[PDB]
């Protein structure tokens with residue numbers, strides 16, 4: 001069994017994320033670009049493109065009206081089903097607050113789930129400087145997304161203001177937001193690709209991610225003294241995420257290391273997760289020994305059940 005992973009960008013922000021991921025290089029993942037904006041879709045690098053709402057917009061964006069994105073997606077339902085068909089997992093990514101993302105992304109998520117895919121949303125909330133109407137349409141979209149998906153990761157754009165200095169280029173800040181999706185996707189590809197010593201597979205991802213609500217995905221890398229504890233802390237850190245580790249009741253944790261990976265280190269990492277949660281966590285634990293590695297340890301966490 002080799003699970004089919006698809007990433008679907010919906011609207012401007014969603015498609016920017018897809019474009020920056022394709023640009024960065026990513027294999028065994030199919031990308032789908034969905035938009036009302038024909039100008040933007042023409043410049044997309046995605047292998048499969050769906051223009052929605054040509055009747056409604058005549059190839060322009062939806063102009064900040066979420067009912068137009070919704071109706072656009074509904075009328076292109078069969079084209080969307082066809083593009084998804086055969087996926088085992090779908091990541092739907094979108095910026096909430098606009099017309100197309102806000103309205104179309106939950107429809108896409110709903111179609112994905114009813115095609116049988118494990119469906120994860122990764123969405124942004126607008127910057128506060130964008131104003132209250134934007135924030136309020138965004139919140140309606142987030143609730144709609146939450147209803148449609150299996151699990152939802154929310155990245156408030158205001159959090160980007162916590163990781164920049166006064167000169168950090170906007171595109172560099174956006175790339176940091178993109179990493180949440182990219183590394184979440186990559187960590188699932190990696191789990192599926194490798195047969196670990198204590199193996200985790202797609203059915204374990206399904207157990208943790210299916211019909212939950214909020215989620216956290218994370219990866220942390222470290223080496224040398226305290227590598228396991230530091231990799232675990234990095235894995236659970238959530239500066240850009242609305243949903244932190246606290247209150248997590250289920251965690252999929254994988255530790256990858258060289259032949260030096262110690263049992264003691266494995267427990268240290270697991271206990272960082274347990275203790276940061278402040279709940280009695282139901283852990284799905286895995287380990288991979290990759291003899292090509294020297295002193296590096298990688299800890300992967302997916303946490304749900306808040």
Ligand SMILES: Nc1nc2c(ncn2[C@@H]2O[C@H](COP(=O)(O)OP(=O)(O)O)[C@@H](O)[C@H]2O)c(=O)[nH]1
Pocket residue numbers: 010011012013014016017061062063064094095096097098099100101102124125126127130134157174177
């Ligand atoms: N982090 C991030 N946020 C974005 C990006 N593009 C747009 N946004 C945000 O997403 C919201 C909706 O924008 P957009 O997706 O272009 O609207 P739509 O195409 O009408 O859905 C904006 O109000 C911004 O908060 C991006 O590339 N990165």
Ligand SMILES: [Ca+2]
Pocket residue numbers: 190191192193194195196199200201
């Ligand atoms: Ca595996």
